[PDB]
Design a protein around this ligand. Structure first.
Ligand SMILES: [Cl-]
Ligand SMILES: [Cl-]
Ligand SMILES: [Cl-]
Ligand SMILES: [Cl-]
Lengths: 237, 239
């Protein structure tokens, strides 16, 4: 059974209480919702281990989405931050401003999106797990993952050194590839990994360029504050 | 750093390595979809993925990768990462959305189960194989934890395939790029490599057998094993 306050009248983004370590994935779909001006609700999940939430995301993590299908026949779900980006782009990015407008654009967007989804994302997640969650400390495993993060930063730096390549996928504008990468490729996260982010200057410039976008600023502010308003858990008003 | 003499893009070119049990589980993915759709393609066997010319195609220096002509045929584009190669082939060649999804509902579930593989089982299995075989030192505690995480992913797939009428991972009716992406890491042979008894996930095992019976899947496994063992060891194969 779902909580009484969980109703799907529009896109519902599932998050947890905003902390330094709880927002780097939930901010991704929120950035795109803010960029496109998509009507949405915020549901603050008290416990991702709750059976009702496992029915939405079998992987028992945020972010997740419930939304009405375009024809209203189905309640659609998206889970895994990358999948939430793909869903919002599919349902709401009519012009392919962030999703890509042609086969050529989408070929590069999916390259750099999938690089994050398969490489930096999981490497960073395993680094964080072994660094402070695993019951035993495994420094050789932690060091190899931190080494792999620097290899990923090197690739992103190489791309952003290519002539006129202002964003990861497309030269001209940010895409879901850029939104997916940003939280794991900015100064604060680099410092968490014990890295000097200045050693990737084009990647740092890119992170500042992304960070100056009003939609990104709004997303970071809101994700920090979720659960710290008048309501702690459930559907925010 | 120049491209090899025999590398030309007159059609889709799929970059692979010499076929072994542990070199083909990612390259087989786009090859399955190419065989399913009947896409005309060439195979290029990469001798050294560390070669500068190859990093200009895939900066991550791994197979699979694709070079293909743009739709209008005036330009060349690239796809790298097995998941990206599947998304590209579906975009360019699956206009009916038979494997890519025909609407927002279908694509929502396809992208959920495709991304689960791309984010969870795929990277976990990759790190497992790396620490098990490739890493200069053996770290059995790391290896054991990754093996445990594989069983958690198998548990999720098993739950999904136990849902009423859920014959495939994403859609009830037919297999999609989500099923193609998952199969190589969720079959009896791979489960045995990880030191797992695949029978503990009966609906997942039944699903892997159903997928394996598809003629395009049989052709892909048959071909990917042979690449680099024919009359030409490296470079553009003749087909
Ligand atoms: Cl993800
Ligand atoms: Cl996530
Ligand atoms: Cl991938
Ligand atoms: Cl891959």
């Amino acid at each position: 059974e779902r909580p009484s306050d969980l109703v799907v009248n529009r896109l519902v983004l599932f998050v947890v209480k905003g902390t330094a370590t709880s927002t780097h994935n939930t901010v991704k779909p929120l950035i795109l919702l803010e960029e496109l001006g998509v009507p949405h609700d915020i549901y603050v999940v008290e416990k991702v281990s709750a059976p009702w939430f496992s029915e939405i995301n079998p992987h028992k993590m945020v972010p997740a989405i419930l939304d009405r299908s375009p024809d209203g026949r189905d309640t659609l779900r998206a889970w895994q931050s990358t999948s939430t980006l793909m869903y919002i782009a599919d349902a709401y990015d009519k012009d392919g401003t962030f999703g890509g407008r042609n086969v050529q654009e989408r070929s590069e967007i999916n390259n750099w999106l999938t690089l994050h989804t398969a490489a930096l994302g999981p490497t960073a997640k395993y680094w964080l797990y072994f660094y402070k969650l695993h019951p035993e400390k495994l420094p050789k495993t932690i060091e190899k993952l931190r080494s792999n993060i620097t290899v990923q930063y090197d690739i992103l730096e190489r791309r952003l050194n290519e002539p006129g390549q202002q964003y990861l996928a497309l030269k001209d504008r940010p895409t879901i590839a850029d939104i997916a990468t940003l939280p794991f490729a900015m100064k604060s996260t680099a410092e968490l990994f014990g890295l000097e982010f200045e050693k990737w200057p084009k990647l740092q410039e890119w992170s500042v360029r992304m960070g100056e976008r009003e939609a990104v600023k709004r997303a970071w502010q809101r994700v920090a504050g979720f659960g710290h308003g008048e309501k702690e858990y459930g559907m925010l008003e």
